UniProtKB/Swiss-Prot annotation, chains A, B, C:
Superkingdom of the source species: Eukaryota
Organism field: Homo sapiens
Subcellular location(s) of the protein: Secreted
Annotated site, Important for binding TNFRSF6B, chain positions: 100, 103
Location of this fragment in the whole protein: 88 to 251 of 251
UniProt topological domain (Extracellular) ranges: 1-164
Protein name: Tumor necrosis factor ligand superfamily member 15, secreted form
Signal peptide start and end residues: none
Disulfide bridge map: 75-115
Gene that specifies this protein: TNFSF15
């Protein structure tokens, strides 16, 4: 009953990531599923090698959730008479890459300190906001540690975007 | 003041939960307020039997936040033996029922490990994403533990959806 | 290219907060960046006096993320009586002020208990939902403690809204 359904849209879901070697200050981009299950891309919105390609200039709502999981470090142990230690952390950043502009722009960042006292831990980081994007722009999701990303379920780790 | 405004929309808010009988091993569904305070259903969106009934096929953005609260368990107090205990957890899942399976499809899931050290705790889990739905499809929010859900305020626990 | 690109929209980003003498019986409102970097206001959306002024009645999706951070307190140090301490907490509330009703209406609230063991901690609280708003209504983001708000990056703390 409408014609605004021709707007670029995409919902991508996590897939097994390929273990890569990187420096602490490096944030690997995630690989996504774009056609199977709940994943999809329509109306010219295309997915290609970690990037979501913007086909039309306009304001887009961009979102992503990344569930992290891992064994509890020793952040919580037996310190001194009141001298704890720095906590670990996890981070998700949604980045925008423009061909005319080399240096990527960080649009969203979700960062959390981690220092649990249990056997193991897990938690999601959700991010969502509206940005003005240009045709040709490319979006990618970077995380602090690929090995901590839960890639098991399409409903726990995803990334999507739509033209408003 | 817009032509494209007759779109199905709804924002549901939490209420004290009426106990429902425990029949099977599954996440119990939350039931909501849909017409009082900040809650509403309009343009054919139908809130029925704990489900948000989709009146028109298309792409919808659905979202929910559930705030959990409780007394701290004994997870923190690990048996003196250099061995931490398995952490507790809280989960929120948004499910789709299409009657075309009719096995429910989990659209979004937010799950966090919980091993607090204070006397008590509380935290929210927020989820939101876009999905292609058909008329007749049904959406519900399920949780890991009804007794841990904060039902005190309409602004702390809610669920909503709108046609893009 | 479109026809609905004339809808009120805005994405606000954090800035160093100016010390204020707020009333102890209320959460201080944050002030934002509205035109530099990733921030913007358009199609009549008006950011004035810490408020996002609604220029057109309709249904709006509003969101915000506030990243909090601080040096851990004594909560982690359970009482010498083998009893846990009441936790500290961080809260974000998105409030609506109307010309009609005298008191403000809380639309969204994200509240989290804080009782870390590490030396320091940091975490984001993200909120997003849809509300029916009338021209003239004003939206603001209030927080429990301004000194715990990370004002460092435009991608960590933000606030936005767009007409549906
Ligand atoms: Mg009722």
């Amino acid at each position: 009953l409408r014609a605004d359904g021709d707007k670029p849209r995409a919902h991508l879901t996590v897939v097994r990531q390929t273990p890569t070697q990187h420096f602490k200050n490096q944030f690997p981009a995630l690989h996504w599923e774009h056609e199977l299950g709940l994943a999809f891309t329509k109306n010219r919105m295309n997915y290609t090698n970690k990037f979501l390609l913007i086909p039309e200039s306009g304001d887009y709502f961009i979102y992503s959730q990344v569930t992290f999981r891992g064994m509890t470090s020793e952040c919580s142990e037996i310190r001194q008479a009141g001298r704890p230690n720095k906590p670990d952390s996890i981070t998700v950043v949604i980045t925008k890459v423009t061909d005319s502009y080399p240096e990527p722009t960080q649009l969203l960042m979700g960062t959390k300190s981690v220092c649990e006292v249990g056997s193991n831990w897990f938690q999601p980081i959700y991010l969502g906001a509206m940005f003005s994007l240009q045709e040709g722009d490319k979006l990618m999701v970077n995380v602090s540690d690929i090995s901590l990303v839960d890639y098991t379920k399409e409903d726990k780790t995803f990334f999507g975007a739509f033209l408003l």
